[PDB]
Amino acid sequence: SLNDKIVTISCKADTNLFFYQVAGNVSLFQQTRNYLERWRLIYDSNKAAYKIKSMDIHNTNLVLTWNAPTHNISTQQDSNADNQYWLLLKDIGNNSFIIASYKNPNLVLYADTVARNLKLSTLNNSNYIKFIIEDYIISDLNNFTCKISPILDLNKVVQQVDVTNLNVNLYTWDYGRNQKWTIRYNEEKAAYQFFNTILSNGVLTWIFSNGNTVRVSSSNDQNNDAQYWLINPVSDTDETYTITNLRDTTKALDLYGGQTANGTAIQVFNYHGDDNQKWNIRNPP
Amino acid sequence: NSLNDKIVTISCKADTNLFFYQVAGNVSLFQQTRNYLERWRLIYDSNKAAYKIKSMDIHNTNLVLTWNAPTHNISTQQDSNADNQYWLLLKDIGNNSFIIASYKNPNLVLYADTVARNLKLSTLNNSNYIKFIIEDYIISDLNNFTCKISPILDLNKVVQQVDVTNLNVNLYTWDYGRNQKWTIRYNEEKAAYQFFNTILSNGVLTWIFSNGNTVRVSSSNDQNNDAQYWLINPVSDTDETYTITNLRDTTKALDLYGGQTANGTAIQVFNYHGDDNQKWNIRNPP
Amino acid sequence: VERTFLPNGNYNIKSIFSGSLYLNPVSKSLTFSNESSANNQKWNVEYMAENRCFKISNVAEPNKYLSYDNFGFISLDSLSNRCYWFPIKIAVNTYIMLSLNKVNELDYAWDIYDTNENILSQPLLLLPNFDIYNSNQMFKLEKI
Ligand SMILES: CC(C)S[C@@H]1O[C@H](CO)[C@H](O)[C@H](O)[C@H]1O
Ligand SMILES: CC(C)S[C@@H]1O[C@H](CO)[C@H](O)[C@H](O)[C@H]1O
């Protein structure tokens, strides 16, 4: 079910530390939103266990390896060995994983947060053996404060007009908080919300009851589909996406007519995949 | 939390015909019984992040799965919320099985001794003997169950396919014909069921939505038609009574036409109101 | 002078899964490796009468004793109450080795995981013991 997913792996005992890899050395390190902390899970169904392969661009063949019999964990060349297979055991209710060696299932990964590396331990109730395995896109975008620029004009961005005017348009980047969005992933609903930083609970929303108009409204109401969006990566890119609405996934976020003029409208429109429906989600400089 | 308060059957990945069975404080592995002897309530403690596994025994009502430390034995004892009465449910993703570890001592997990037909605690290995299938008790009971379906207005009558070539479905007195028997199959991807009439290989109960409320059987050779799938929901206080709604549109219920109990009365779908003519006993054939 | 069923002195230590593999330290773990004829595969067993247990030190590192850590592994460490072992002799040269102290209020014992009788590269662990029938907890002590 998780086969071929590219994920980040972070520590329950410290959710700011992620499995990090360089030149064969595995460590625990802050969030990088890049390949150094991205891993592909490769399922072997006979063993009912996973290889955990680094997405390193320079060496493409490294997998998480237990240097049995030592306490040490590293990455080595994939030789399909027992010490490079792992059981992914999800602790239900707790929403975390225990990661046990296929070579010796009595031993599981242990996060030594003080040494910033991985060790092994027999099973126990500590958080230091618990891990958060997350689709890498969700990992990078969740709680990320960003600016949203159309592919057609990068020096401009999607903005709320001001703290009282809740409409949303295109305007040149000026570092204003009305031009920045904090992305929250809703696990219950498998979709994202965009919180404008000029407000406390103002989310990008598709005002269905008025055609294609999108504004920001309060996130207070318990159930909605217009308030939520799906973010999908355009392949061959590292920061471009399309943004489709949860209510109706055929409706994508659209820059009115492809016009890159200040004040141009932003509204949901039928998905065509053209350049006026592609958005760079970026770190604010 | 997703498992909290769920009533489940627990069976062995190493022998899927053996289920956790409870009686008078003893826990054993037994064939499927489709009844309370093999039913357990999973009870979540959020502080411990672990679960009690409570027996649905009808006589002794406070019995939970218990590790008899310092031995390796397992029994059911009075719930006192002790650590040896708590368990971690670790789902082995991709294998659809659980390792069930003692909260008291996670070095130790449940181990199925299929030869003695009981359970003990063990350190870990890669065998199926420490792997278990935890399943909602309704799905467990109904999956691969060959049944007859009788309306509760007349338990002597049954839902039948007319014959091998006439695919209409109507109500008729029970005559033990294979045309009057259906095998239920759960589809985990669609989270819904199909009813296969046993007089054919691939004929399933289907709402013919291109013709009002008519239901007939049609081949399952059709790939993606939600009209062939159904949700089966128990009516509370009952062991065999259900409502049967269509996956295409869950507002539509299996419905005995007019509440008429005469031979030949039509079986259809209809807007769900939960009256007696939308209630069905799913039963073992005598 | 002999106080017990297991004389003081130097021993090789082996799993019953193999007559050709020998207990030695590799980094901070303990494991069973090919015959080296060296002192790191020689273990000095010494009876402590006060508490009726045995201390087992490595002859290449005479002030290090077989012990256990907080992660489930057997270790080579300084003297402490974790270095006390309570053997159960179950045959001529075959023993189960319990920690003197109850751990997690159970008997715990040396334990070596096998894969179809192969133990290569496995660390020696400390795991629950319930009886004298666990193959992965049976070890041979050979005078040498
Ligand atoms: C000149 C226009 C037809 S371009 C047209 O405008 C539409 C307005 O809703 C949408 O934005 C489309 O994406 C765009 O191609
Ligand atoms: C006397 C009738 C209106 S009762 C009526 O018949 C319908 C026939 O489609 C359905 O079976 C309804 O469930 C039922 O209430």
mmCIF file of N, CA and C in Angstrom, chain A residues 66-73 104 107 118-121, chain C residues 22-33 40-41 43 58 61 64-69 71-77 111-112 119-126:
data_model
loop_
_atom_site.group_PDB
_atom_site.id
_atom_site.type_symbol
_atom_site.label_atom_id
_atom_site.label_comp_id
_atom_site.label_asym_id
_atom_site.label_seq_id
_atom_site.Cartn_x
_atom_site.Cartn_y
_atom_site.Cartn_z
ATOM 1 N N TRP A 66 21.262 -1.728 8.498
ATOM 2 C CA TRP A 66 21.744 -2.006 9.839
ATOM 3 C C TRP A 66 23.059 -2.749 9.747
ATOM 4 N N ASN A 67 24.118 -2.128 10.257
ATOM 5 C CA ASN A 67 25.456 -2.722 10.224
ATOM 6 C C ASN A 67 25.573 -3.762 11.322
ATOM 7 N N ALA A 68 24.747 -4.803 11.218
ATOM 8 C CA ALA A 68 24.733 -5.893 12.178
ATOM 9 C C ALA A 68 26.139 -6.444 12.279
ATOM 10 N N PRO A 69 26.620 -6.738 13.495
ATOM 11 C CA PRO A 69 25.912 -6.742 14.771
ATOM 12 C C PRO A 69 25.981 -5.444 15.555
ATOM 13 N N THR A 70 26.537 -4.380 14.982
ATOM 14 C CA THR A 70 26.761 -3.139 15.751
ATOM 15 C C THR A 70 25.467 -2.424 16.063
ATOM 16 N N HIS A 71 25.566 -1.347 16.829
ATOM 17 C CA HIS A 71 24.431 -0.474 17.100
ATOM 18 C C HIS A 71 24.198 0.556 15.976
ATOM 19 N N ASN A 72 25.006 0.507 14.926
ATOM 20 C CA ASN A 72 25.029 1.574 13.947
ATOM 21 C C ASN A 72 24.111 1.361 12.745
ATOM 22 N N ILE A 73 23.506 2.467 12.313
ATOM 23 C CA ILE A 73 22.664 2.513 11.123
ATOM 24 C C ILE A 73 23.337 3.428 10.109
ATOM 25 N N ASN A 104 16.463 -8.858 12.366
ATOM 26 C CA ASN A 104 16.156 -9.214 13.726
ATOM 27 C C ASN A 104 15.013 -8.355 14.235
ATOM 28 N N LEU A 107 14.600 -5.935 17.162
ATOM 29 C CA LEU A 107 15.304 -4.684 17.187
ATOM 30 C C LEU A 107 14.631 -3.705 16.264
ATOM 31 N N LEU A 118 20.775 7.494 14.465
ATOM 32 C CA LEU A 118 19.890 6.372 14.693
ATOM 33 C C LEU A 118 20.646 5.226 15.346
ATOM 34 N N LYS A 119 19.954 4.519 16.226
ATOM 35 C CA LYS A 119 20.493 3.354 16.901
ATOM 36 C C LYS A 119 19.414 2.282 16.870
ATOM 37 N N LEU A 120 19.593 1.226 17.650
ATOM 38 C CA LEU A 120 18.590 0.187 17.745
ATOM 39 C C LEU A 120 18.177 -0.056 19.174
ATOM 40 N N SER A 121 16.985 -0.595 19.330
ATOM 41 C CA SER A 121 16.534 -0.997 20.640
ATOM 42 C C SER A 121 15.508 -2.083 20.531
ATOM 43 N N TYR C 22 32.107 -18.298 17.683
ATOM 44 C CA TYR C 22 32.633 -18.014 19.005
ATOM 45 C C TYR C 22 32.287 -16.602 19.438
ATOM 46 N N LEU C 23 31.862 -16.470 20.691
ATOM 47 C CA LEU C 23 31.529 -15.180 21.259
ATOM 48 C C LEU C 23 32.742 -14.255 21.335
ATOM 49 N N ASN C 24 32.611 -13.080 20.718
ATOM 50 C CA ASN C 24 33.576 -11.991 20.865
ATOM 51 C C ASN C 24 32.917 -10.633 20.660
ATOM 52 N N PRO C 25 33.553 -9.556 21.171
ATOM 53 C CA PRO C 25 33.072 -8.205 20.903
ATOM 54 C C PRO C 25 33.406 -7.740 19.495
ATOM 55 N N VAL C 26 32.435 -7.120 18.845
ATOM 56 C CA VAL C 26 32.631 -6.392 17.603
ATOM 57 C C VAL C 26 32.040 -5.004 17.864
ATOM 58 N N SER C 27 32.872 -3.968 17.793
ATOM 59 C CA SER C 27 32.511 -2.644 18.303
ATOM 60 C C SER C 27 31.957 -2.822 19.727
ATOM 61 N N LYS C 28 30.774 -2.289 19.999
ATOM 62 C CA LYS C 28 30.198 -2.372 21.332
ATOM 63 C C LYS C 28 29.217 -3.534 21.486
ATOM 64 N N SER C 29 28.939 -4.253 20.412
ATOM 65 C CA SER C 29 28.089 -5.427 20.497
ATOM 66 C C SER C 29 28.874 -6.678 20.812
ATOM 67 N N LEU C 30 28.146 -7.734 21.160
ATOM 68 C CA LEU C 30 28.698 -9.085 21.257
ATOM 69 C C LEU C 30 28.105 -9.933 20.143
ATOM 70 N N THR C 31 28.936 -10.784 19.547
ATOM 71 C CA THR C 31 28.517 -11.616 18.431
ATOM 72 C C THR C 31 29.351 -12.892 18.365
ATOM 73 N N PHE C 32 28.875 -13.846 17.579
ATOM 74 C CA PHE C 32 29.562 -15.119 17.381
ATOM 75 C C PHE C 32 30.292 -15.119 16.036
ATOM 76 N N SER C 33 31.624 -15.206 16.076
ATOM 77 C CA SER C 33 32.452 -15.076 14.870
ATOM 78 C C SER C 33 33.330 -16.295 14.639
ATOM 79 N N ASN C 40 40.288 -12.371 22.535
ATOM 80 C CA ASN C 40 38.961 -11.758 22.542
ATOM 81 C C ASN C 40 37.846 -12.809 22.465
ATOM 82 N N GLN C 41 38.209 -14.049 22.125
ATOM 83 C CA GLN C 41 37.272 -15.170 22.192
ATOM 84 C C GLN C 41 37.436 -16.030 23.453
ATOM 85 N N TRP C 43 37.005 -16.177 27.620
ATOM 86 C CA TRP C 43 36.174 -15.556 28.627
ATOM 87 C C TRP C 43 36.487 -16.148 29.994
ATOM 88 N N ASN C 58 36.322 -10.565 29.618
ATOM 89 C CA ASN C 58 37.040 -10.892 28.394
ATOM 90 C C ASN C 58 38.524 -10.832 28.680
ATOM 91 N N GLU C 61 40.447 -7.965 27.405
ATOM 92 C CA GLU C 61 40.093 -6.738 28.121
ATOM 93 C C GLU C 61 39.620 -7.087 29.532
ATOM 94 N N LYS C 64 36.816 -5.509 31.664
ATOM 95 C CA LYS C 64 35.467 -5.444 31.081
ATOM 96 C C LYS C 64 34.717 -6.760 31.307
ATOM 97 N N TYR C 65 33.443 -6.652 31.668
ATOM 98 C CA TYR C 65 32.596 -7.811 31.955
ATOM 99 C C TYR C 65 31.365 -7.836 31.066
ATOM 100 N N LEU C 66 30.867 -9.036 30.786
ATOM 101 C CA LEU C 66 29.587 -9.155 30.105
ATOM 102 C C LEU C 66 28.490 -8.523 30.968
ATOM 103 N N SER C 67 27.763 -7.606 30.351
ATOM 104 C CA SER C 67 26.776 -6.814 31.022
ATOM 105 C C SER C 67 25.618 -6.590 30.044
ATOM 106 N N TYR C 68 24.727 -5.668 30.368
ATOM 107 C CA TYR C 68 23.661 -5.303 29.450
ATOM 108 C C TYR C 68 23.383 -3.816 29.535
ATOM 109 N N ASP C 69 22.905 -3.272 28.424
ATOM 110 C CA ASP C 69 22.646 -1.852 28.295
ATOM 111 C C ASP C 69 21.128 -1.603 28.370
ATOM 112 N N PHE C 71 19.106 -0.873 25.990
ATOM 113 C CA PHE C 71 18.545 -1.017 24.653
ATOM 114 C C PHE C 71 18.298 -2.480 24.262
ATOM 115 N N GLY C 72 18.562 -3.386 25.203
ATOM 116 C CA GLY C 72 18.296 -4.797 25.039
ATOM 117 C C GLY C 72 19.514 -5.600 24.622
ATOM 118 N N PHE C 73 20.666 -4.948 24.451
ATOM 119 C CA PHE C 73 21.880 -5.626 24.039
ATOM 120 C C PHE C 73 22.743 -6.074 25.220
ATOM 121 N N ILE C 74 23.372 -7.243 25.089
ATOM 122 C CA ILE C 74 24.514 -7.583 25.928
ATOM 123 C C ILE C 74 25.664 -6.646 25.559
ATOM 124 N N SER C 75 26.504 -6.347 26.545
ATOM 125 C CA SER C 75 27.557 -5.359 26.403
ATOM 126 C C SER C 75 28.781 -5.802 27.178
ATOM 127 N N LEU C 76 29.908 -5.165 26.882
ATOM 128 C CA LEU C 76 31.138 -5.283 27.653
ATOM 129 C C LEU C 76 31.360 -3.981 28.409
ATOM 130 N N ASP C 77 31.336 -4.036 29.732
ATOM 131 C CA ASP C 77 31.285 -2.827 30.551
ATOM 132 C C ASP C 77 32.093 -2.984 31.827
ATOM 133 N N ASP C 111 20.145 -14.095 24.573
ATOM 134 C CA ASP C 111 19.280 -14.527 23.491
ATOM 135 C C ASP C 111 19.917 -14.137 22.170
ATOM 136 N N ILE C 112 20.084 -15.109 21.297
ATOM 137 C CA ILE C 112 20.680 -14.889 19.981
ATOM 138 C C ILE C 112 19.659 -15.305 18.930
ATOM 139 N N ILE C 119 23.113 -17.727 12.644
ATOM 140 C CA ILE C 119 23.273 -16.604 13.557
ATOM 141 C C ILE C 119 24.313 -15.551 13.119
ATOM 142 N N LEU C 120 24.870 -15.689 11.924
ATOM 143 C CA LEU C 120 25.961 -14.804 11.535
ATOM 144 C C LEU C 120 25.537 -13.325 11.611
ATOM 145 N N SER C 121 26.394 -12.515 12.234
ATOM 146 C CA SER C 121 26.208 -11.070 12.352
ATOM 147 C C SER C 121 25.136 -10.643 13.353
ATOM 148 N N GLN C 122 24.555 -11.596 14.092
ATOM 149 C CA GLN C 122 23.544 -11.291 15.089
ATOM 150 C C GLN C 122 24.188 -10.838 16.397
ATOM 151 N N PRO C 123 23.679 -9.748 16.977
ATOM 152 C CA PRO C 123 24.134 -9.349 18.299
ATOM 153 C C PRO C 123 23.458 -10.181 19.373
ATOM 154 N N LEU C 124 24.177 -10.454 20.450
ATOM 155 C CA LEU C 124 23.599 -11.148 21.572
ATOM 156 C C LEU C 124 22.712 -10.172 22.331
ATOM 157 N N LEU C 125 21.466 -10.575 22.554
ATOM 158 C CA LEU C 125 20.492 -9.711 23.212
ATOM 159 C C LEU C 125 20.139 -10.244 24.604
ATOM 160 N N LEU C 126 19.428 -9.416 25.367
ATOM 161 C CA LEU C 126 18.886 -9.819 26.671
ATOM 162 C C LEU C 126 17.379 -9.789 26.614
#
